Scaffold this active site. Structure first.
Site, PDB file in Angstrom:
ATOM      1  CE1 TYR A  49      -1.506  26.849  44.361  1.00 20.63           C
ATOM      2  CE2 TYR A  49      -3.397  25.373  44.636  1.00 20.63           C
ATOM      3  CZ  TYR A  49      -2.696  26.284  43.864  1.00 20.63           C
ATOM      4  OH  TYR A  49      -3.154  26.638  42.599  1.00 20.63           O
ATOM      5  CG  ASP A 155       5.063  28.726  41.658  1.00 18.63           C
ATOM      6  OD1 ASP A 155       4.899  29.864  41.124  1.00 18.63           O
ATOM      7  OD2 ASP A 155       4.501  28.372  42.733  1.00 18.63           O
TER       8      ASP A 155
END
Ligand SMILES: O=C(O)c1ccc2c(c1)nc(NCCCCCCNCc1ccc(-c3ccccc3)c(Cl)c1)c1ccncc12
Length: 331
Positions: A49, A155
């Site tokens: 990302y 995460d």
């Protein structure tokens, strides 16, 4: 008839009690600064990302990190921004320093504090049993904080924990997968690194909560004290559940399924099988015993559980005997 619902057993309603603006991120308005205040020095690493650069702020001559965002949905950028602003200042949370857009490309970038990252190649052999307890406790400081602030990180993994060992400083980074917790909300199970996905992710149980983060933390701790990176080395999302089942046993897994009435993907029907709940001693050997200990194994066992309600909380973890030594040294 449907999945059985679930509620987080700590910080359940923290967000309901806040003003709408705290967690309604879709309606947040962002102030784009000028990327020209920062010049990029070098690429520090990429990913799915974003790409991260060391940069200098030309107005105060200060080292800094610029995280240029690859295209994600606009909601996700506001989400990460809102969450770093709510978490700003908190223990061992990375600090967002600015939010700039590029003049010509119009692509957005977050600017973070610089952290002299200590080389993890040489850090893997100068890691003592105390250092693991010390830095594990620092991670819980940050996990308990954001859990208490109504935010699940989703995460937690080695690439998202930075350490400046020279000054015993730790920072929890990349909050682009983090969400706000809301009782009864169903979340996306396609999150986190494959080796750190919690069983509630692999069986597609959407009503999870902060305890997701504790499983991930259990995967890291296990890989540290056993020197087995990663601890659950599955070849895909289905096999990742089997690799967990070969350690935690199937009996507890099917209990979890029945308790929450989770309908199990038929792809699983012929690969799980029947496996006993192993004993942690299996993974102990001459090169790693100097970090394994009766407390560490107890603390690990109370983290890596199928049923997310029964994992320790972050606060409960800090009060575990495994950290009794680092808690007194902080005095
Ligand atoms: O995207 C964001 O928000 C963001 C914000 C700021 C920065 C950023 C991303 N990225 C940077 N560079 C990416 C480097 C990869 C991280 C290296 C992993 N670190 C291993 C590791 C060691 C030890 C342990 C450990 C655990 C338990 C006990 C003992 C040790 C673990 Cl778990 C992992 C960066 C660099 C400098 N300044 C700021 C940022």
């Amino acid at each position: 008839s449907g999945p059985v619902p679930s509620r987080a057993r700590v910080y359940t309603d923290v967000n309901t009690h806040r003003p709408r603006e705290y967690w309604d991120y879709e309606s947040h308005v962002v102030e784009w600064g000028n990327q020209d205040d920062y010049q990029l020095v070098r690429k520090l690493g990429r990913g799915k990302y974003s790409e991260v650069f060391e940069a200098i702020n030309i107005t105060n001559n200060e080292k800094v990190v610029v995280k240029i965002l690859k295209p994600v949905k606009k909601k996700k950028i506001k989400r990460e921004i809102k969450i770093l602003e709510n978490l700003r200042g908190g223990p061992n949370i990375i600090t967002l320093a600015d939010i700039v857009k590029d003049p010509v490309s119009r692509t957005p970038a977050l600017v973070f504090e610089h952290v002299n990252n200590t080389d993890f190649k040489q850090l893997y052999q100068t890691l003592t049993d105390y250092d693991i307890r010390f830095y594990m406790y620092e991670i819980l400081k940050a996990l308990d904080y954001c859990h208490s602030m109504g935010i699940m990180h989703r995460d937690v993994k080695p690439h998202n924990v930075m350490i400046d060992h020279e000054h015993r400083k730790l920072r929890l980074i990349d909050w682009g997968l983090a969400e706000f917790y809301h009782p009864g909300q169903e979340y996306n199970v396609r999150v986190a690194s494959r080796y750190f996905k919690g069983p509630e992710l692999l069986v597609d149980y959407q009503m999870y909560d902060y305890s997701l983060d504790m499983w991930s933390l259990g995967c890291m701790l296990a890989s540290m004290i056993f020197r087995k990176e990663p601890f659950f080395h599955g070849h895909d999302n289905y096999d990742q559940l089997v690799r967990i089942a070969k350690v935690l046993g199937t009996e507890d897994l099917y209990d979890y399924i029945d308790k929450y009435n989770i309908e199990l993907d038929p792809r699983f029907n012929d690969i799980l099988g029947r496996h006993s709940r192993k004993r942690w001693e299996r993974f102990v050997h001459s090169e790693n015993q100097h970090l394994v200990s009766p407390e560490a194994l107890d603390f690990l066992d109370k983290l890596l559980r199928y049923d997310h309600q029964s994992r320790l909380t972050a606060r409960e973890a800090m009060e575990h005997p495994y950290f009794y030594t680092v808690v007194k040294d902080q005095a």
